[PDB]
């Protein structure tokens, strides 16, 4: 896997553009919550999953930058 | 160890 360091850098460069989707979803959520009567079960579940994935993803990258070498 | 982060 002596090529995978390239994918590592790409992910670091990509996430600054993808990650704001979470806040954008919340900013719009402000309205959906009211008009949908709180019927946001799908949004809540996805947010919880993201929390997990985001924390794990950062953890891996913090290790990889040193272990990959 | 297999631990997880969470909040309430």
């Amino acid at each position: 896997i002596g090529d995978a360091n390239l994918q590592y850098s790409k992910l670091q460069e990509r996430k600054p553009e993808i990650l704001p989707l979470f806040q954008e979803a919340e900013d719009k959520n402000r309205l959906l919550r009211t008009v949908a009567g709180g019927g946001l079960e799908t949004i809540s579940n996805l947010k919880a999953k993201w929390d997990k994935f985001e924390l794990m993803m950062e953890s891996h990258q913090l290790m990889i930058k040193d272990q990959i070498e | 160890k297999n631990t997880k982060q969470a909040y309430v």
């Binding site: - | 297999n2 631990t3 997880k4 982060q5 969470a6 909040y7 309430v8």
Partner: protein, 86 residues
């Protein structure tokens, strides 16, 4: 009072014990620190240390827990956070 579970990463048996233990603690004690202490001690005995418990009407927490040892639930208006760590 009425038990409402919001979050759990925990076996069904431990979840039920969490509610039962908190229910007894809430019936027996008035002071939050003593309610929490009752709940924690019961888990350390049956499911081994190290458990932690916070009981209250107004708080947020950010904690790290052992897999399969986390629950967050209410008894009426009182929130209980019960988990293992260490």
């Amino acid at each position: 009072r009425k038990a409402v579970i919001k979050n759990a990463d925990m076996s069904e048996e431990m979840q039920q014990d969490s509610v039962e233990c908190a229910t007894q603690a809430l019936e027996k004690y008035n002071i939050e620190k003593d309610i929490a202490a009752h709940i924690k001690k019961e888990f350390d005995k049956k499911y081994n240390p190290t458990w932690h418990c916070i009981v209250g009407r107004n708080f947020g927490s950010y904690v790290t827990h052992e897999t399969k040892h986390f629950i967050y639930f209410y008894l009426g208006q009182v929130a209980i956070l019960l988990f293992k760590s260490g």
